[PDB]
Amino acid sequence: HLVCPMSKSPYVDPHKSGHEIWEEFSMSFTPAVKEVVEFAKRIPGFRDLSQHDQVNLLKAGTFEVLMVRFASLFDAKERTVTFLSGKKYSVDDLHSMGAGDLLNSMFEFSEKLNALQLSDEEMSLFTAVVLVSADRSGIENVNSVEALQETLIRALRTLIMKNHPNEASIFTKLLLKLPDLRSLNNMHSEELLAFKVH
Numbered sequence: 173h174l175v176c177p178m179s180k181s182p183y184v185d186p187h188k189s190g191h192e193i194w195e196e197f198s199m200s201f202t203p204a205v206k207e208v209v210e211f212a213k214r215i216p217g218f219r220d221l222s223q224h225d226q227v228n229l230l231k232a233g234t235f236e237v238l239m240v241r242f243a244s245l246f247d248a249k250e251r252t253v254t255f256l257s258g259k260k261y262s263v264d265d266l267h268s269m270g271a272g273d274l275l276n277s278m279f280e281f282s283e284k285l286n287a288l289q290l291s292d293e294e295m296s297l298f299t300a301v302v303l304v305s306a307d308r309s310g311i312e313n314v315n316s317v318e319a320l321q322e323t324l325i326r327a328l329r330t331l332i333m334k335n336h337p338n339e340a341s342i343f344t345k346l347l348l349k350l351p352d353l354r355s356l357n358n359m360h361s362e363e364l365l366a367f368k369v370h
């Protein structure tokens with residue numbers, strides 16, 4: 173199976189070669205990836221980073237951006253995951269096909285985030301913060317990346333304070349999701365690389 177909801181379905185044709193499986197999978201996830209590139213380009217300070225650093229932040233952060241953007245695919249009440257085809261699958265069925273601890277963690281994250289009930293403008297600005305908070309391992313101009321992050325974070329504080337004047341803790345709660353996203357990224361990358369088709 174292929175229990176990633178970026179796929180159209182978790183069922184894999186055992187006659188198809190691995191190259192063929194991956195290529196099919198790629199027609200499903202590539203449009204989502206390109207959408208993160210387009211989004212990055214609309215963060216004004218992102219264009220002022222070095223070309224190398226833009227590419228590196230996208231490299232390290234795309235997953236974390238997509239995890240925020242697709243948190244709603246995880247329905248903690250119904251205990252279902254919606255794949256990009258529109259089809260829904262139960263957690264039990266997905267556990268049976270090889271999902272495990274990482275799926276559970278994703279439900280946990282998604283439930284807490286989905287819960288905060290962010291507006292679109294709030295979610296959008298948070299997502300920008302997530303992107304520019306990506307792992308700095310490849311980065312050549314660290315101070316420029318931290319400056320953009322600080323800029324976006326102040327903007328986020330100002331927006332949450334306008335929209336939630338008596339609940340400033342929402343701001344802090346969002347920042348606390350950054351290490352959680354990094355943990356999800358870490359574990360997911362292990363699953364990605366350990367993926368075999370036969």
Ligand code: COH
Pocket residue numbers: 173174175176177178201205235238239242243245270271272273274275276278360363364365367
């Ligand atoms: C919204 C969450 C999300 C995103 C954005 C995402 C984005 C991407 C992505 C982006 C281009 C790629 C190449 C992959 C690639 C993979 N993902 Co995901 N995955 C995600 C959630 C998951 C989950 C959940 C699983 C199964 C985890 C588990 O518990 O086994 C997963 C599993 C996988 C697997 C292993 C499947 C298996 O062993 O059956 C691969 C490969 N992937 N994933």
